[PDB]
């Protein structure tokens, strides 16, 4: 009954600027954001930072990593499926990122990196799809806003944020992560067991240029694309 | 609608032994085996052994094994939970261990012995909360039978046993996994977040014994006990 958009886009590319200037745009709108903070402090619903962890040693956090980080988000993403948005008129639920992006685009690359064996990878997708398989048909997404930058504006919007687990990542990482953004939403050449996802609408927005100027634009182009929905 | 009892028992404690007697003494009863060999060749619903990785390196595994093997018994009790028992008169299924012996005796242990981190036992704990949060309330229990055996008589039916990976298990792990046994269902000194579990009933028996001998005894103690509840 909410009609529920999913923000993708690579590291640093601009998702919570863009995140930030959503609400303002309607009342009827709602923003999940990713829980990157609590990766990043560890405590139960100061602690450990598995965000760190994973970026220290991949081969031996990713499938933790991966494991917590995607749960994590389905919990924010259903919560907000129990706020105020259900006593709205047109109530339009924002996901930054999705599970989609955590299976398909992160944890297939940190596999794809030797990062997690056949042990590890086998037993993410069992949880992932059996994840899905329950609360799942809930949280389908009726659009995607792919927020399009190269790699190298990535890796330097990345120094500007200052988050320090980041500053380590390298363009070459960047890189592996951009084309999968672009085999999943450009060309439109990724397999997943998600079938309606084949078929869910997308906006591309090429977020490389300065916001303070594409703001005026990006906003039309998201109207436009929510009335298509 | 169904009595739902989970047998608790230390490792090679006779427990698949006492569910194979089971069946044949009512048409009515229903049981749910330990995924034991599902842990053996992870696959999806020949590949790796996961049971396996974590006896030989536990500080690398325990996180995973206690993910993977939680969320497998809990699946394959939820199945059971929807099956020809449903249209049974006096339907009673029973649990090979339950999500509280994974947590309260194998990942608590594996903790306490440093083969989990702060933060992989601070997740873990977050995870089991939230599952049973989800489907928990449909698996909880009416009551449980203690299969009570020395650690001693333990380690030596592991050996007649013969599964590779428990053959390298020394008595010192079969004591600490004891100890936590008799401090839950035997001095009944354990805390828990579920609440119910302190007031459940509780049937012990002495499995030290021959099982030749001793089953004649122990039937009658689980009618018995099965008839109070
Ligand atoms: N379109 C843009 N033009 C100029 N700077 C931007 C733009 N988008 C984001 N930034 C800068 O990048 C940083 C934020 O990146 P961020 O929004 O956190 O990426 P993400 O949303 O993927 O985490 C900010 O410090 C902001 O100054
Ligand atoms: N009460 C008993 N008396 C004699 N032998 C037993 C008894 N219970 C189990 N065993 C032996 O131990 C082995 C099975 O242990 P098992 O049932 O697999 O432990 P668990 O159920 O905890 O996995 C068998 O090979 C069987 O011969
Ligand atoms: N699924 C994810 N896997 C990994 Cl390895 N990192 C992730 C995942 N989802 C989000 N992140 C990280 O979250 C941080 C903020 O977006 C970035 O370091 C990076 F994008
Ligand atoms: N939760 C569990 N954690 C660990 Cl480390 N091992 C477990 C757990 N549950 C069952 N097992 C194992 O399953 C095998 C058969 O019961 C034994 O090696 C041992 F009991
Ligand atoms: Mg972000
Ligand atoms: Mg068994």
């Known amino acids: 009954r909410i009609?529920?958009?999913?923000?993708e886009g690579n590291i640093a590319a601009g998702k919570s600027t863009f995140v930030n200037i959503l609400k303002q745009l309607c009342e009827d709108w709602e923003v999940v954001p990713e829980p990157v903070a609590r990766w990043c402090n560890v405590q139960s619903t100061n602690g450990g930072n598995v965000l760190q962890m994973m970026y220290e040693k991949p081969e031996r956090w990713s499938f933790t990593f991966q494991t917590?980080?995607?749960?994590?988000?389905i919990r924010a993403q259903l919560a907000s499926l129990n706020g105020?948005?259900?006593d709205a008129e047109k109530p339009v639920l924002f996901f930054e990122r999705s599970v989609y992006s955590d299976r398909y685009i992160f944890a297939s690359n940190l596999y794809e990196?030797?990062?997690?064996?056949?042990?590890?990878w086998t037993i993410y997708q069992d949880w992932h799809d059996w994840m899905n398989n329950q609360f799942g048909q809930s949280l389908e997404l009726d659009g995607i806003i792919y927020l399009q930058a190269t790699?190298?504006?990535?890796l330097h919007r990345i120094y500007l944020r200052g988050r320090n687990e980041e500053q380590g990542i390298p363009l070459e990482?960047?890189?592996?992560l951009h084309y999968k953004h672009e085999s999943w939403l450009l060309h439109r050449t990724l397999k997943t067991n998600f079938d309606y996802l084949q078929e869910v609408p997308i906006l591309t927005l090429d977020?490389?240029?300065d916001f303070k100027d594409k703001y005026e634009?990006?906003?039309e182009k998201v109207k436009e694309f929510l009335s298509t929905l």
């Open 3 to 7: 009609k529920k958009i999913s923000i």
């Open 173 to 176: 990482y960047l890189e592996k």
């Open 84 to 86: 105020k948005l259900k």
């Open 217 to 219: 634009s990006l906003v």
């Open 113 to 120: 990196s030797e990062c997690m064996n056949e042990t590890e």
């Open 151 to 154: 790699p190298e504006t990535c």
């Open 68 to 73: 917590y980080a995607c749960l994590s988000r």
């Open 207 to 209: 977020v490389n240029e």
